Structures are given as structure tokens and as C-alpha cells.
Amino acid sequence: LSPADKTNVKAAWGKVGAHAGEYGAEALERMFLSFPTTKTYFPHFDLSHGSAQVKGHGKKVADALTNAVAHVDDMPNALSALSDLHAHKLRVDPVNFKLLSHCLLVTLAAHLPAEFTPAVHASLDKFLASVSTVLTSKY
Amino acid sequence: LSPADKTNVKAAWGKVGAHAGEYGAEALERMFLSFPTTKTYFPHFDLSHGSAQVKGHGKKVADALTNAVAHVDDMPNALSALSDLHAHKLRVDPVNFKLLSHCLLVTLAAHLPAEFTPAVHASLDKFLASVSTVLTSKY
Amino acid sequence: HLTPEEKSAVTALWGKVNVDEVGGEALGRLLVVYPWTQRFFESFGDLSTPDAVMGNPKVKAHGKKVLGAFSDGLAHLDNLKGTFATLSELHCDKLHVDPENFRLLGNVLVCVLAHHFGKEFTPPVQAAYQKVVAGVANALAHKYH
Amino acid sequence: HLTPEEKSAVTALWGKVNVDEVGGEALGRLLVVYPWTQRFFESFGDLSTPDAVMGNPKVKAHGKKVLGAFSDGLAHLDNLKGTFATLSELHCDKLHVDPENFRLLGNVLVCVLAHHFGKEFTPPVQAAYQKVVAGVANALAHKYH
Numbered sequence: 197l198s199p200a201d202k203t204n205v206k207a208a209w210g211k212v213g214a215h216a217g218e219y220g221a222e223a224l225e226r227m228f229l230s231f232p233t234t235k236t237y238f239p240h241f242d243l244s245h246g247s248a249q250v251k252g253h254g255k256k257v258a259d260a261l262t263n264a265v266a267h268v269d270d271m272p273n274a275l276s277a278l279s280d281l282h283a284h285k286l287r288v289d290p291v292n293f294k295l296l297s298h299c300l301l302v303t304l305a306a307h308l309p310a311e312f313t314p315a316v317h318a319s320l321d322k323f324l325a326s327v328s329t330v331l332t333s334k335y
Numbered sequence: 336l337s338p339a340d341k342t343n344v345k346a347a348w349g350k351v352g353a354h355a356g357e358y359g360a361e362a363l364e365r366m367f368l369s370f371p372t373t374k375t376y377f378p379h380f381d382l383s384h385g386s387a388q389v390k391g392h393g394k395k396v397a398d399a400l401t402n403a404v405a406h407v408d409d410m411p412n413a414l415s416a417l418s419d420l421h422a423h424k425l426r427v428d429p430v431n432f433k434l435l436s437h438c439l440l441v442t443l444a445a446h447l448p449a450e451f452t453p454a455v456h457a458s459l460d461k462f463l464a465s466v467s468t469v470l471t472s473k474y
Numbered sequence: 475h476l477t478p479e480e481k482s483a484v485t486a487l488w489g490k491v492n493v494d495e496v497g498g499e500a501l502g503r504l505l506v507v508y509p510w511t512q513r514f515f516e517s518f519g520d521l522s523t524p525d526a527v528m529g530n531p532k533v534k535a536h537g538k539k540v541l542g543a544f545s546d547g548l549a550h551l552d553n554l555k556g557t558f559a560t561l562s563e564l565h566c567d568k569l570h571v572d573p574e575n576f577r578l579l580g581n582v583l584v585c586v587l588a589h590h591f592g593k594e595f596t597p598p599v600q601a602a603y604q605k606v607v608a609g610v611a612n613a614l615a616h617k618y619h
Numbered sequence: 620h621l622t623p624e625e626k627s628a629v630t631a632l633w634g635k636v637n638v639d640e641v642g643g644e645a646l647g648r649l650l651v652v653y654p655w656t657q658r659f660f661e662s663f664g665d666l667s668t669p670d671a672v673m674g675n676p677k678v679k680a681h682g683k684k685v686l687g688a689f690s691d692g693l694a695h696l697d698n699l700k701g702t703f704a705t706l707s708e709l710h711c712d713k714l715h716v717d718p719e720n721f722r723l724l725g726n727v728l729v730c731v732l733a734h735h736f737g738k739e740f741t742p743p744v745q746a747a748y749q750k751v752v753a754g755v756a757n758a759l760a761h762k763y764h
């Protein structure tokens with residue numbers, strides 16, 4: 197991640213603020229509706245609209261991304277325990293990290309008119325790929 | 336890469352020895368024949384069977400992999416100049432690194448009956464993905 | 475394979491699309507976000523910056539044709555194979571574009587639509603469009619199948 | 620979309636396949652190399668080691684069925700969609716296996732064939748089989764298309 201990439205990701209995303217919990221919930225719903233294969237990882241969730249579990253989990257996802265931008269230069273060690281979880285316990289298909297990343301970009305685009313520039317869009321996609329790379333590095 | 340993975344990759348591959356130049360040439364031909372989209376990166380090569388250019392380039396590919404196993408704990412710095420080349424100058428489609436990796440596994444399988452165990456196969460696939468990750472990390 | 479509700483969602487939004495701008499906005503972002511696609515647009519000239527790409531007139535002119543192709547696909551969701559046959563031959567047998575880039579361009583387009591329609595591009599609306607762009611990419615890649 | 624020469628290459632090699640062993644050899648390597656596919660085989664029991672997977676009788680029994688499906692596809696290379704229709708419904712609408720794993724299993728199979736036939740699995744022979752496994756994966760994923 198280039199210095200400009202880090203600047204852009206701190207920017208795009210400072211603007212997400214206290215909506216971050218609600219944006220991650222929306223990203224999941226977007227993933228569940230657009231790519232139904234992903235729902236089989238949440239058989240024990242009520243994946244309906246406004247589900248308290250999707251909201252609660254979207255907040256955890258968003259917080260993990262906050263922690264990643266806060267430690268962007270040492271993400272493997274910050275996301276270490278999440279890497280073990282997603283690869284060992286959950287064996288998440290690596291394909292699925294691209295699906296959620298795409299929905300995270302869509303969610304940001306739809307909520308950040310001004311921030312989602314072509315350059316910021318490019319930086320956010322690099323950021324989410326690095327997070328995805330870390331979360332898939334433990335198979 | 337786990338300690339067992341490194342052991343396996345030094346093994347599988349010690350056995351490749353001085354055939355390494357010929358195996359990389361075969362891997363490329365396998366890629367060119369099975370996935371013809373990849374040939375457009377070599378318009379200036381004669382991609383026919385026994386081509387001196389494919390042999391010469393296969394040796395360079397194999398040597399780079401040798402250098403990677405020799406510096407497996409610091410591949411980003413060992414493969415640094417190749418990362419700039421493949422991403423900046425050549426803009427290689429990241430998809431194509433999976434195609435060549437698959438053909439490298441096929442080539443090894445067809446030449447190393449005893450070494451290509453399920454575990455070694457798994458370790459070699461992890462090794463080539465890490466190399467691919469490094470060579471695609473500079474877009 | 476769209477429902478009446480998904481068709482309704484897709485055409486209602488598409489009617490509001492600025493077909494002179496959206497195509498080039500998506501092709502440009504493709505060239506910026508996945509810069510290896512620039513390999514196929516050497517003739518277009520200045521792609522050295524994000525601003526250069528977006529403001530490049532050739533990128534805008536070409537994306538207009540690309541969006542022209544998407545509009546045709548929307549009008550023939552039940553025969554996307556035939557619609558994109560000649561484009562498949564071009565992108566597959568002639569250009570040798572890896573079909574994974576079709577999926578990427580489609581998802582980039584989805585991002586452009588979300589960018590321009592905000593809350594209106596709801597999760598259900600997105601689901602319908604993901605089916606559309608998936609079908610286009612699969613149709614455009616038929617010559618590889 | 621195979622030529623007479625590629626068909627000739629594919630059937631000549633397939634006639635030598637040990638259909639009681641090759642299927643399970645490939646499913647096992649899939650479960651070992653891409654361990655997230657084990658998520659769909661919890662019932663199979665011990666998958667804790669490579670030896671456990673390969674020597675697991677359920678893996679061998681199931682792979683035999685999988686290779687049964689590939690043999691059927693080879694006999695109907697011109698109608699792979701119809702052949703795999705019911706398997707598509709199963710793997711798509713019921714199991715929700717991401718179709719990228721079809722490509723992986725196919726490429727794993729290619730590795731198994733190279734392993735067992737050595738020099739005989741030539742680059743041209745591989746090219747023909749890559750077409751075969753690509754078509755199977757695409758057919759098995761039709762219910763997503």
C-alpha cells in the first residue's frame with residue numbers, strides 16, 4: 197500500500213464515522229442477496245432485513261476494518277486471530293472475500309458521494325485485498 | 336509458509352536439479368497450449384515446440400523460483416525487481432499467475448513420481464501462490 | 475433469469491442512466507483500479523494519472539460503446555448469448571482478454587451505479603444487477619466455453 | 620469443442636484410467652490442497668492429516684462417483700449441459716458450492732493424471748483435458764448462470 201493509498205483510506209473512511217456499524221450490516225445484506233452461496237456460512241443467523249444478528253455482526257466486521265486501517269503497516273499481526281478464525285475454524289472460501297469486498301465498495305460508494313473518487317476507489321480496493329490476503333493466509 | 340511447507344519445497348525441488356531450466360520451458364508450453372490467452376504477452380517469441388526463446392525464458396523462470404526457495408523467508412525483497420517488472424512494465428493479469436502455477440505443478444507431477452505427494456503438492460501450491468502474491472503486489 | 479421484480483428494479487434505474495457519461499466513468503475506473511487492463515488501450519494515450527484517464531476523451535468515447543452493449547443486453551436478457559456473439563468473437567478470439575476482466579468491469583459498473591444513485595441503489599436492486607452483469611460476462615466469454 | 624486430435628488424445632489416456640482409484644485420489648488432494656472444501660465433507664470423519672484423507676474410505680468411495688460423472692461427460696462432450704443438469708441443481712441450488720471449486724477440482728484431476736502418466740501426459744494432451752474440465756465445471760455451474 198502506497199503512502200497515497202493510506203492517505204485515501206484514512207480519508208474515505210474517517211467520513212464513515214459512527215455509521216461504520218450500519219455500513220457493514222448493509223455490506224453483508226448486499227453480499228447475501230447478490231451472492232446467495234455466502235449465506236451457508238450463517239445458517240444460525242436470521243439473515244432477514246433489519247436482523248439484530250446481521251447488525252451486530254456488521255459492527256464487528258466494520259470494527260475489524262477500523263482496526264486494520266489503524267494498524268495498516270502491520271495488518272498481519274493485527275488481523276492474526278481473525279486469520280486463524282476464518283481459515284481454520286470457518287474455512288471461508290477465499291472467493292467469498294472478493295464478494296464481501298465488492299459489496300463493501302458498493303456500500304461506501306452509495307454513502308460517500310464525494311469521497312468515492314476513482315483514486316480513492318482504487319485505494320480502497322487495494323486496502324480490502326490486503327485485508328482479504330491476510331484473512332486467507334492461514335489455510 | 337509453515338516449516339513443513341518449506342521442508343517439502345526444498346525437497347520436491349532439490350530433486351528438480353539441473354532439469355529446472357527444461358521444466359520451466361515445459362511449464363510455459365503447457366500454459367501456452369492450455370490457456371492461449373497467455374500467448375499475447377509473448378508476441379515477439381516463437382512459441383513453437385523446441386523454441387530457443389521458450390527454453391531460454393523457461394530457464395529464467397526456473398532460476399527465479401530457485402532464488403525464491405533460497406530466500407523463502409524474505410521473498411518480497413528477493414522478488415522485488417520481478418514484482419515491478421510484471422506489474423508495472425508488463426502489467427501481467429493476476430489471473431495468469433494461477434495458470435502458470437498450475438502448469439508448474441503439472442510439470443513437476445509428470446517428472447517427480449515419488450516427490451509429488453498430496454502433502455508436497457499442497458506445499459508447492461502454497462509456495463507458488465506466495466510467489467504469485469509477491470509478483471502481483473506492485474500494481 | 476430475472477424475476478418481474480428484478481426486471482422492474484433494473485429497468486426503472488436504467489431509464490435514469492446518463493448513457494453519454496456512465497460508460498466512460500466505468501471504463502476509466504477499470505483502467506485505474508485494475509491497471510493491467512490498460513495493456514489493451516495503449517492507443518488511447520495519456521493514462522498516467524487517474525485524472526488523465528477519466529478526462530481522456532478516448533476513454534469516454536469507448537465506454538459509451540461499452541454501455542451501448544450493456545443496454546442491448548438488458549433488452550435481451552433471455553438471449554444474451556446471441557446478442558454478444560460477435561463481441562465474444564472479438565474479445566475472445568481476437569483480443570484475448572481474460573474473461574475475469576469482464577466480471578471486473580461489470581462489478582466496476584455496479585460501483586458506478588451505486589455512486590450515482592446512492593440510497594436508490596438498494597441491496598435488492600444490486601442483486602438484480604449482479605445477475606445482469608454476470609450474464610453479460612458469461613455471454614461475452616462464450617467463445618472460451 | 621474438441622478436435623479429432625484432442626478427442627483422440629483424451630480417450631486414449633482415459634481408457635488407461637483406474638476408475639476405482641483416480642477419483643478418490645483427486646478428491647483427497649482437493650481436500651488437502653484447498654482445505655476449505657472439507658467444509659462440505661464433515662460427515663466423512665478423519666480429515667485431520669493428508670494420510671487420513673487419502674486413506675479415508677469415504678473419500679475414496681465418493682471420488683469414484685465423481686470420476687463416474689467425469690466419464691459420462693467425456694462421452695457427451697457435445698451436450699455437457701444436459702448431462703450435468705441434475706448435478707448442477709444439486710451442487711448449486713442445494714449444496715451452494717462456489718463454482719470456483721469446480722475449476723479447482725478439475726485442475727487437481729489434471730495434476731493426478733500428470734502424476735500417474737508422466738511423460739505420456741504431454742502438453743498437447745493437457746490442453747485437451749483443460750478444455751474437458753473447463754466444460755464440466757461450466758456445465759456443473761449452469762444453475763448459477
Ligand code: HEM
Binds near residue numbers: 256261278282297
Ligand atoms: C474483510 C473481510 C472480513 C472481515 C473483516 C471479517 C471479520 C469478522 C469478524 C470481526 C468476525 C467476528 C469474530 C469473533 O467475534 O470472534 C467474523 C466472524 C465470521 N465471519 Fe468474517 N470477516 C470477513 C470476511 C468474511 C467472509 C467473506 C465470510 C463468508 C463468506 C465470513 C464469515 C464469517 C462467519 C460465518 C463468522 C462467524 C459468525 C458467527 O458465528 O457469529 N467472513 N468475521
Ligand code: HEM
Binds near residue numbers: 377395
Ligand atoms: C511464478 C511466476 C513467474 C515467474 C517466477 C516469472 C519470472 C520471470 C523472469 C525471471 C523474467 C525475466 C526478467 C528479466 O529477464 O529481466 C520474466 C519476464 C517476463 N514474464 Fe514472467 N514470471 C512469472 C509469471 C509470468 C506470467 C504468468 C506471465 C504472463 C502470462 C509472464 C510474462 C512475462 C513476460 C512477457 C516477460 C518478458 C519476456 C521477454 O520480454 O523476454 N510471467 N518473468
Ligand code: HEM
Binds near residue numbers: 515539561565
Ligand atoms: C465486460 C463487458 C464488455 C463489454 C460489453 C464490451 C464492449 C465492447 C464494445 C461494444 C466494443 C466496440 C466494438 C466495435 O467497435 O465494433 C469493444 C471493443 C474493445 N474492447 Fe470491450 N467490452 C467489455 C469488456 C472489455 C474488457 C474487460 C477489455 C480489456 C481489459 C476490453 C477491451 C476492448 C478493446 C481493446 C476493444 C477495441 C477492439 C478494437 O477496436 O479492435 N473490453 N468492447
Ligand code: HEM
Binds near residue numbers: 687688721756
Ligand atoms: C467439479 C466437478 C464435480 C463433479 C463431477 C462432482 C460429482 C458429484 C457426484 C456424482 C455426486 C454424487 C451425487 C449423488 O450421489 O447423487 C456428488 C455429490 C457431492 N458433491 Fe460433488 N462433484 C464435483 C465438485 C464438487 C465440489 C468442488 C464440492 C465441494 C467443495 C462437491 C461437494 C459434493 C457433496 C458435499 C456431495 C454430497 C451431496 C449429498 O450427498 O447430498 N462436489 N458430486
